Each structure stands twice: as C-alpha cells, then as structure tokens.
Design an enzyme around this catalytic site. Sequence first.
Site, PDB file in Angstrom:
ATOM      1  N   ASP A  53     -12.837  -7.312  13.369  1.00 56.51           N
ATOM      2  CA  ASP A  53     -11.806  -8.183  12.809  1.00 56.51           C
ATOM      3  C   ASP A  53     -11.330  -9.224  13.814  1.00 56.51           C
ATOM      4  O   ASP A  53     -10.884 -10.308  13.418  1.00 56.51           O
ATOM      5  CB  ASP A  53     -10.619  -7.352  12.324  1.00 56.51           C
ATOM      6  N   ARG A  96       0.851  -1.181   0.000  1.00 62.78           N
ATOM      7  CA  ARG A  96       0.000   0.000   0.000  1.00 62.78           C
ATOM      8  C   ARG A  96       0.888   1.233   0.000  1.00 62.78           C
ATOM      9  O   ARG A  96       1.871   1.295   0.743  1.00 62.78           O
ATOM     10  CB  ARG A  96      -0.946   0.009   1.208  1.00 62.78           C
TER      11      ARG A  96
HETATM   12  C1  LIG Z   1      -6.317  -4.081   2.413  1.00 63.32           C
HETATM   13  C2  LIG Z   1      -7.611  -3.864   3.087  1.00 63.32           C
HETATM   14  C3  LIG Z   1      -8.596  -3.131   2.518  1.00 63.32           C
HETATM   15  C4  LIG Z   1      -9.787  -2.943   3.144  1.00 63.32           C
HETATM   16  N1  LIG Z   1     -10.744  -2.214   2.586  1.00 63.32           N
HETATM   17  C5  LIG Z   1     -11.903  -2.054   3.203  1.00 63.32           C
HETATM   18  C6  LIG Z   1     -12.972  -1.274   2.642  1.00 63.32           C
HETATM   19  O1  LIG Z   1     -12.821  -0.763   1.577  1.00 63.32           O
HETATM   20  N2  LIG Z   1     -14.089  -1.167   3.310  1.00 63.32           N
HETATM   21  C7  LIG Z   1     -14.271  -1.734   4.476  1.00 63.32           C
HETATM   22  O2  LIG Z   1     -15.323  -1.572   5.033  1.00 63.32           O
HETATM   23  N3  LIG Z   1     -13.333  -2.475   5.045  1.00 63.32           N
HETATM   24  C8  LIG Z   1     -12.189  -2.671   4.482  1.00 63.32           C
HETATM   25  N4  LIG Z   1     -11.228  -3.407   5.084  1.00 63.32           N
HETATM   26  C9  LIG Z   1     -11.497  -4.008   6.344  1.00 63.32           C
HETATM   27  C10 LIG Z   1     -11.399  -3.080   7.526  1.00 63.32           C
HETATM   28  O3  LIG Z   1     -10.137  -2.579   7.456  1.00 63.32           O
HETATM   29  C11 LIG Z   1     -11.549  -3.791   8.833  1.00 63.32           C
HETATM   30  O4  LIG Z   1     -12.487  -4.779   8.719  1.00 63.32           O
HETATM   31  C12 LIG Z   1     -12.000  -2.919   9.995  1.00 63.32           C
HETATM   32  O5  LIG Z   1     -11.076  -1.885  10.122  1.00 63.32           O
HETATM   33  C13 LIG Z   1     -12.122  -3.725  11.263  1.00 63.32           C
HETATM   34  O6  LIG Z   1     -12.192  -2.911  12.381  1.00 63.32           O
HETATM   35  P1  LIG Z   1     -11.866  -3.280  13.800  1.00 63.32           P
HETATM   36  O7  LIG Z   1     -12.391  -2.305  14.580  1.00 63.32           O
HETATM   37  O8  LIG Z   1     -12.387  -4.487  13.983  1.00 63.32           O
HETATM   38  O9  LIG Z   1     -10.326  -3.297  13.909  1.00 63.32           O
HETATM   39  P2  LIG Z   1      -9.255  -2.194  13.639  1.00 63.32           P
HETATM   40  O10 LIG Z   1      -9.703  -1.169  12.843  1.00 63.32           O
HETATM   41  O11 LIG Z   1      -8.133  -2.849  13.162  1.00 63.32           O
HETATM   42  O12 LIG Z   1      -8.983  -1.649  15.050  1.00 63.32           O
HETATM   43  C14 LIG Z   1      -8.226  -2.211  16.073  1.00 63.32           C
HETATM   44  C15 LIG Z   1      -7.815  -1.164  17.073  1.00 63.32           C
HETATM   45  O13 LIG Z   1      -7.436  -1.738  18.280  1.00 63.32           O
HETATM   46  C16 LIG Z   1      -6.217  -1.242  18.724  1.00 63.32           C
HETATM   47  N5  LIG Z   1      -5.561  -2.244  19.547  1.00 63.32           N
HETATM   48  C17 LIG Z   1      -5.031  -3.349  19.170  1.00 63.32           C
HETATM   49  N6  LIG Z   1      -4.551  -4.004  20.180  1.00 63.32           N
HETATM   50  C18 LIG Z   1      -4.780  -3.314  21.252  1.00 63.32           C
HETATM   51  C19 LIG Z   1      -4.539  -3.411  22.698  1.00 63.32           C
HETATM   52  N7  LIG Z   1      -3.917  -4.444  23.214  1.00 63.32           N
HETATM   53  N8  LIG Z   1      -4.950  -2.443  23.470  1.00 63.32           N
HETATM   54  C20 LIG Z   1      -5.534  -1.428  22.959  1.00 63.32           C
HETATM   55  N9  LIG Z   1      -5.782  -1.275  21.696  1.00 63.32           N
HETATM   56  C21 LIG Z   1      -5.439  -2.157  20.805  1.00 63.32           C
HETATM   57  C22 LIG Z   1      -5.501  -0.824  17.479  1.00 63.32           C
HETATM   58  O14 LIG Z   1      -4.602   0.202  17.682  1.00 63.32           O
HETATM   59  C23 LIG Z   1      -6.636  -0.358  16.622  1.00 63.32           C
HETATM   60  O15 LIG Z   1      -6.950   0.997  16.729  1.00 63.32           O
HETATM   61  C24 LIG Z   1     -10.007  -3.584   4.442  1.00 63.32           C
HETATM   62  C25 LIG Z   1      -9.000  -4.320   5.012  1.00 63.32           C
HETATM   63  C26 LIG Z   1      -7.834  -4.493   4.371  1.00 63.32           C
HETATM   64  C27 LIG Z   1      -6.761  -5.292   4.990  1.00 63.32           C
END
Ligand SMILES: Cc1cc2nc3c(=O)[nH]c(=O)nc-3n(C[C@H](O)[C@H](O)[C@H](O)COP(=O)(O)OP(=O)(O)OC[C@H]3O[C@@H](n4cnc5c(N)ncnc54)[C@H](O)[C@@H]3O)c2cc1C
Length: 420
Positions: free
Chosen positions: A298, A180
């Site tokens: 995720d 990326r």
């Molecule tokens: C290449 C790519 C392209 C994508 N494109 C899209 C798209 O176009 N549209 C879409 O909807 N989705 C897309 N996704 C998917 C999307 O990125 C994720 O599904 C989404 O961000 C999931 O969110 P989350 O909150 O679950 O996790 P995340 O966004 O990953 O958040 C996790 C958070 O937890 C924190 N964290 C981790 N461990 C700890 C800890 N021990 N203590 C405190 N904090 C912690 C991290 O710092 C982070 O802020 C894409 C993914 C990829 C890989």
Amino acid sequence: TALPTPRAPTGISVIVVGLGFGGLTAAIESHLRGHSVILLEKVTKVKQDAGDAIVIGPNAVRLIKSWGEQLCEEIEPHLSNATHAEMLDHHDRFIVRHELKGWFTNRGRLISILYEHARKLGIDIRLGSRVTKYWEEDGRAGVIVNDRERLAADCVICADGVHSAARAWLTGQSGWANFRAHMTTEQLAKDPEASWVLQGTREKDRVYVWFGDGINLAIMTMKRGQELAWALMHTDKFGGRASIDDALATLSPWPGRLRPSSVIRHTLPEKLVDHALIYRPPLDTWVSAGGRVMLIGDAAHPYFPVVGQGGSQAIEDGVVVATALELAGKENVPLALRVAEKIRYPRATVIQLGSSTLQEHLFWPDWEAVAKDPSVFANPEWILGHDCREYTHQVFDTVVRAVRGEGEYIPRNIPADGAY
Ligand SMILES: Cc1cc2nc3c(=O)[nH]c(=O)nc-3n(C[C@H](O)[C@H](O)[C@H](O)COP(=O)(O)OP(=O)(O)OC[C@H]3O[C@@H](n4cnc5c(N)ncnc54)[C@H](O)[C@@H]3O)c2cc1C
Ligand SMILES: [Hg+2]
C-alpha cells in the site's frame, strides 16, 4: 515439508518495515531464499477484529502454500463457507448474483497464522518498534527505531501501509471513508424489520452488497448466523470518531434504505470504526535515489477496495523483491531493487488504475447499461492464474539488460492493450 529449510546464506541483510501482508511476505520469502532478515513493526500485537473480512486471490494463495503444507490446515477453520454474493441497488432491488480457489477469511487471523509461522522459521521479528528517519549512504541504508536506535542493512524494504512515512521521505512531497463493524445477532433476531438477514444463515454464510448514489454497503453473516459484519464506503466523512447515526444518515437518501438500515442500527458503539480511505496516483518510482530503499504494498500503490487484490499484490511485491535479491547477489543490491520495480510496477499500476475506474462504475452505475447486461457489473485469468515467482525467474536476465540499458523489456505479466 511442513517447515521448509532456507537456502544457503546469501550474505544480504534486509530490513523490512511492517507486519502487514507486504512486510510478512518480504520477510518470509527473503529468509527462505537465504537473506538475513529483521522485521520491524510498531504494534505490540497483531490486531484482531472479527469484522475485518478479506479475500485472498489464488495468485497469492499458491505463494503462501509454498511456505509450508500445514498453513492450509491452520486457515481451514477460519475460511467462510459463503459461495455467492447477492448484489442489489440503492432501491433494494436485485441486480445479479456473483460467485464468492481463494481465501475468504479474517484478516487478523490470517496475519497471526503467518506471524506465528514466521517465528517457527526463526525470523527475527521485533514488535513495538516504531520506524522513522530513513537514511541512506553508499553501500548501506537504514532506519531509526523508537528514536533511540540506529539500524543499517544492505537494503530497506518499506511496507508500512497507506500512511507511509517512507513514501513521504522517498518522495519528499480523497474524501472517501469506510465504516466497518461486527455484531452478534441476538438483539437483531428480536427485531422483525431486521430478522430477515438471518434467513438461511445456519446452512451457510450469506453476503449482501448494495450499490448506488455514491455509496457501497456489504453485509456478511458468520458463524451459522450468530454473528455478522458489515462495511460502508462513502464520501460523507466530516482524532478519530465513529457514530452509527452517521452511517444511518448516509443511507437515509436511499429509497431502499429499510432493510439495510434495520440491520446496522443494532451495532454496538464500541464495535464500529469509520476510517478515512487514502488513494494516490501511481508514483514515478518506488526506489530511492541511492537505490537501497524501496516501497512495496500500500505504501507504493494504494487501491480502491473494489478489486480484492491489494493484499495479493503486496504479497507479489514481497516475493519478487526477495527473488530479485537472490538472483542479483550481494554486490548488486541496487540492481535487484530496480529489477523488481520494473517487473512489479506495470502489474500493480494496471490494477491500481483499474480500481479507480471500476470505483466510478460501482458507486454511480450506468443503470441502463446494467439493465441490458448485469453480468459485467459484479477477476480475469491474467491476474488469478499468474505465478510471480516463476515469471521473475523467466525474465530476470531480460530485465537486467533493460535496466542497464542493454535491451528492451515487454511486460507480459499484464494483458496486451490492457486496462484491467
Ligand atoms: C476496506 C478495505 C477492504 C479491503 N479488502 C481487501 C480484500 O478483500 N482483499 C485484499 O486482498 N485486500 C483488501 N484490501 C487491501 C489490503 O487491506 C491492503 O492492500 C494490504 O493490507 C496492504 O498491505 P501492506 O502490507 O502493504 O500494508 P498494511 O497491511 O497496512 O501494513 C502496514 C504495517 O506497517 C506498520 N507500520 C506502519 N507504520 C510503521 C512504522 N513507522 N514503523 C513500523 N511499522 C509501521 C503497521 O502497523 C502495519 O502493520 C482492503 C482494503 C480496504 C481499505
Ligand atoms: Hg486447506
């Protein structure tokens, strides 16, 4: 109302881990529903990358708009004016033109807007708080922050991403990577082998996606052709490391490598990343044995990035969790998490399995079937037109009876006989 007032205090204390789409949604919706919320995030600031473009589906946009009218006015300058994506094969030959309501915008800029909106609502967000050592007792669960502070609550909502330490704790037990990059197009404009990508860019943003031979490459222009970002999914991944020579070597076998390689070779070394992708099969359960710790986003269901729904499904996870906690009450927090799991798991898993099967069709396509029908190569209404909050209110009592073993539950937030 630009700032909605929260419901009356429910008495439920919630610890949310993660400032992503799952964590921010869980904190905002829980606060507005009357829960007492603390959000823990390890980073000290929302990471900002101009090359991290994401698509938010209408099923999630309607949920975000319900948190405040002004949020639309905040995201408007960051929305891409691109309308279509030109799909080509690894011979650089045209296949089909695909479209792309919905938000095609920047990730860090959307998280920053949601984060600032959460602070305007008065939500207790604590950055620089690394979470580990999850624990659970009868009637309470909690975490350890920075290995120095113990916190406890009625439940812990873990949205800590694909590399979830909570999932490892809850369970106790791929080869894909993604380049990326972002760039300014000043030096690229002087290369005649690469200046083609700037054609018609002042009019609107253009999107080019190449598929074939186990590789996916997307190129997106921005800011009237002044900038462009690109992403490359591959299996050639050998601390962190990223080199433009590895990205160029990945495209070398392609017969139509000329036009894409001429563009991405202008990438500056400090603006390129190469992160490993993490996929895992559907989990048996998202809720801990005691019933007061639950994975969302995720951490619970990582997708292959070809469905454009990972962030939207993390948002739907957080809304349903906050809604089930409100309907169950203080004395039924474990029931609330089990109810939210039974509502969310079928929908998130169908999309999860759908991303894995669609992953095969895009990286090694059946070119004979694509030749006879390319319109299939390029999301249905049962995903985009869905309202998770209204569906939760509709089936909550039915799901409670099914969890307690009183009756049956037919999931209708997924298509009947539905694969994806
Ligand atoms: C290449 C790519 C392209 C994508 N494109 C899209 C798209 O176009 N549209 C879409 O909807 N989705 C897309 N996704 C998917 C999307 O990125 C994720 O599904 C989404 O961000 C999931 O969110 P989350 O909150 O679950 O996790 P995340 O966004 O990953 O958040 C996790 C958070 O937890 C924190 N964290 C981790 N461990 C700890 C800890 N021990 N203590 C405190 N904090 C912690 C991290 O710092 C982070 O802020 C894409 C993914 C990829 C890989
Ligand atoms: Hg808007």
